Write a protein that binds this ligand. Sequence first.
Ligand SMILES: CCCCCCCC(=O)O
Ligand SMILES: CCCCCCCC(=O)O
Lengths: 365, 367
Amino acid sequence: APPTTVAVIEGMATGAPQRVVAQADAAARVSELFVDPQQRERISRIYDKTRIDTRRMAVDPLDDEFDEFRREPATIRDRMNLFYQHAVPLAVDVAARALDGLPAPDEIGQLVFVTSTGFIAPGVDVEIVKQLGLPRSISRVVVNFMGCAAAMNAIRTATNYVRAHPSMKALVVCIELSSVNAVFADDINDVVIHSLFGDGCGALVIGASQVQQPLPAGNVVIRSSFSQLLDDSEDGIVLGVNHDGITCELSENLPSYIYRSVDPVVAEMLRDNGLSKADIDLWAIHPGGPKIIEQSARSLGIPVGRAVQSWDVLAQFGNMLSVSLIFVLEMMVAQAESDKPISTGVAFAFAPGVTVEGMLFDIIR
Amino acid sequence: PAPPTTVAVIEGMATGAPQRVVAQADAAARVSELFVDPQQRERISRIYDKTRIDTRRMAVDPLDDEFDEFRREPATIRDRMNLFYQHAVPLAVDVAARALDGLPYAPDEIGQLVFVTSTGFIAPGVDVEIVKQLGLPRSISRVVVNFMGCAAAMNAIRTATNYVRAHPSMKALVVCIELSSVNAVFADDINDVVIHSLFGDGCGALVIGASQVQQPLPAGNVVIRSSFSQLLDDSEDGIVLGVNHDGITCELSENLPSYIYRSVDPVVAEMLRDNGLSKADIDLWAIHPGGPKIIEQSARSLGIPVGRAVQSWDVLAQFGNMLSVSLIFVLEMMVAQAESDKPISTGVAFAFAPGVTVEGMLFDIIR
Ligand SMILES: CCCCCCCC(=O)O
Ligand SMILES: CCCCCCCC(=O)O
């Protein structure tokens, strides 16, 4: 007999590096390194097509001082040291603020640490424990290279924890510093990647509640969680470690995989929870790029602009991989879409596989 | 709400490793050749002898000159990760298939896959090929636990136990694979040679389900009673993992044995007390076979004779240090050869991760 308890987000917080990089300025830095004017207009037409206004970088890519370093080979170890150095102070602040809204450090039983842009042990999860004075006996899980949908896998892990240990809470911390892996382009993909990815941190505090028990406004109930590895999509999203930093490779066919897959997956899931698409008030589509939001919406047969919080996060921060969906959730909690006392929502994102990960959730108003 | 009164059971287990055996004597010969001073070659042979390792398994033949060009060449990390994938998949899939072959054929009951490695980094990775080639459900929950060192199987089991305790109808599959051989480079200092003397290759897989407590279980099942974890202080240097241009690396402090001596007893003592036991109630000590000093200092801390941990010594001797995998090997041995007449054997497993952290389980083997 499964426990009849449910997982609740009781606490959230976001953060990002102080350094803003205007998309206009980034396109200038790149266009300078082209001669043929037919090629310079293609660069500017790429950066304009991103529908990104700003990003936050831990390391300024529009800074000449480290152009020597970013061209130099065999720097991966230095970049991982660089990741640790920025990640700790950012991670610890965001986590501290996710907890600051709430009553007892000895009740936090699990820390789930998510990144696909950092690889170093002992890592940030340890400094989080020490600097926040969490229990030395806390369960730690490090989820790596699960891409942009990694927060969904982390939440599912946290949900399993608190449902097996209802007295206890789980702390989920995601941090992505794409900027630490920035290099001078060889291929088209490289320039496209460098045009989209930014930096951010998000943190969640998850606890268990008895079903039907009353909950304060702003709590998010995780009702249901779904995964789907698709066929003939291995090329879709590819992550690798190079001598000069971690890399991401996105197939030209990725938008086609997204169009094909989203509706059947989301349709089956909703049917399984006795819902139709007309019962969803909130669509938290992963803001990975314009193409990902566009093709996700077209698959679902909803107007592209319906996912306004996704568009807003892309515009202000770009693609922050795992973190992006914590930002979308914070916005949805912060600005209610209607008068309803509960808002029902679907979140999903794409990981290597290709895999579709998502949640059905309720925000209490 | 009240916590579920269910317990996690290992219902399935299997090990594997590369076909290729490499005698410790032969490995020491190749390494001594690449050195000049006869006083230096004495130290190398006395290092390899001191490991108390007889054989290891390599996916990649390290005493093979075609590979020596490559392992001197810089900026090869991507190629080595491609090399990891290429060997890992066939090995991973076989070991997982054999962990499941022990049970009624129902792939649709596997709800979680936890994939553990600190020697490989590539997406989409082995976890995906495992799902496809075994025809596990496309809807299966996947978690990739990376760079949690040699105690990573303990973190994985804890994760799997939380899953099946929240989803009692469902089972979780834990797969650990380490190929140290794909990160082999020519030594610089001392740590380099010591690391290259200890680490080997292996794969282990576990199938975990939930039982109602006191409900009867077949012989060979392992009951996970408790999991425990302890981050220690002034021990950051103890165990360090990093990614280099020419492969993943490991750095072990000269003070690591001191951290192990000081940590193990208090941690294990408190844990046992909390489950209503003393050290005199333990029948099985599954100390992580990381090296002689780790087994020795663990035993000295606990105040048990060093040779008491027989299966740890045997796994080191035959396979060396396989990080996360090593303790699945120790568990298989303990299941395979009963230590006494008792119908249940109670045991403690623990290992060391970056932090430094002590991770472990209290467990019962059904006889
Ligand atoms: C997932 C790691 C890839 C990051 C590449 C650098 C992109 C940028 O920040 O411009
Ligand atoms: C954690 C990775 C360690 C790589 C060292 C290689 C040891 C060997 O295979 O001889």
